[PDB]
Amino acid sequence: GHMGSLNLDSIIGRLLEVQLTENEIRGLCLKSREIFLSQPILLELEAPLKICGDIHGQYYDLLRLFEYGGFPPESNYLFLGDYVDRGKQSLETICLLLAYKIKYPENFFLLRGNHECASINRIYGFYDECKRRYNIKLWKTFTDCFNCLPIAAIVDEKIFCCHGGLSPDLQSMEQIRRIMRPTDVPDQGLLCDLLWSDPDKDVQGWGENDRGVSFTFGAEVVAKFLHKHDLDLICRAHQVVEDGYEFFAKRQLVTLFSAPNYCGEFDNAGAMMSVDETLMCSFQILKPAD
Amino acid sequence: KKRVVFADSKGLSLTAIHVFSD
Ligand SMILES: [Mn+2]
Ligand SMILES: [Mn+2]
Incomplete structure (x- = not known):
């Protein structure tokens, strides 16, 4: 109560008209941080749900995503990370997402991407944006909030969701639950892999990832993971795909990426996956016109 | 289950495809 109260409807209304004070954004970080810490690091969710991939500060595309998927609380949402960096409006993006998290804490969920770590967003845009528009102290407050984000989700005991992918260290879900917060993302280990690894159609088993961190994993790794944990699908993000979604290993894994025409280097669509109450899945594809 | x-x-x-003005 030491910073006073936010007027969250005012903040949301101003964000959708696309001008927050430093204390407003700080309040968004601190209150959402408390909510993240009150919920498990491995979320256990129920459908119906809309699942979204990377945003990377493309705020107008986020607004399009809500327009076509339904603004909260009309739909429930799970985002898979990478809200900031590269795009021009990381601040508006993460502020709107944190506002919805504060207002709908049981119907709106944000996972950690590899860019929700100071070691990464120091370099790829967010630090510079905070410093230009506000100050470094605000960026550090964001870091404190990011360090408490959940790292994976299981929807109805059948869909395993994370930003990056599998880990040769992941033997039990309890290993995920035992990760203590706040934490940064180290450059090796379970947490790293969940935020950084990729599927690869050419690899047999595990390979070294070209990013210089983590791993690649092949189709039999996916099949054995689903088998061992009695799951049906892995849903992850992290890699741009041409249609906004892309299947791997006979639809046992899907990659979602929600930023169209990604950072001006690609001509991709963005997509979100709609999961109804029976776990029937379909995709909504966002294509900007030329 | x-x-x-x-x-x-x-x-x-x-799929559903939403084409929007940029
Ligand atoms: Mn990414
Ligand atoms: Mn990523």
């Missing part, structure tokens, strides 16, 4: 099913395996559209 629920099972993941993709909509085109049930004779429905797998």
Whole structure:
């Protein structure tokens, strides 16, 4: 109560008209941080749900995503990370997402991407944006909030969701639950892999990832993971795909990426996956016109 | 106990495409 109260409807209304004070954004970080810490690091969710991939500060595309998927609380949402960096409006993006998290804490969920770590967003845009528009102290407050984000989700005991992918260290879900917060993302280990690894159609088993961190994993790794944990699908993000979604290993894994025409280097669509109450899945594809 | 099913395996559209003005 030491910073006073936010007027969250005012903040949301101003964000959708696309001008927050430093204390407003700080309040968004601190209150959402408390909510993240009150919920498990491995979320256990129920459908119906809309699942979204990377945003990377493309705020107008986020607004399009809500327009076509339904603004909260009309739909429930799970985002898979990478809200900031590269795009021009990381601040508006993460502020709107944190506002919805504060207002709908049981119907709106944000996972950690590899860019929700100071070691990464120091370099790829967010630090510079905070410093230009506000100050470094605000960026550090964001870091404190990011360090408490959940790292994976299981929807109805059948869909395993994370930003990056599998880990040769992941033997039990309890290993995920035992990760203590706040934490940064180290450059090796379970947490790293969940935020950084990729599927690869050419690899047999595990390979070294070209990013210089983590791993690649092949189709039999996916099949054995689903088998061992009695799951049906892995849903992850992290890699741009041409249609906004892309299947791997006979639809046992899907990659979602929600930023169209990604950072001006690609001509991709963005997509979100709609999961109804029976776990029937379909995709909504966002294509900007030329 | 629920099972993941993709909509085109049930004779429905797998995708909807929203083309928007940039
Ligand atoms: Mn990424
Ligand atoms: Mn990523």
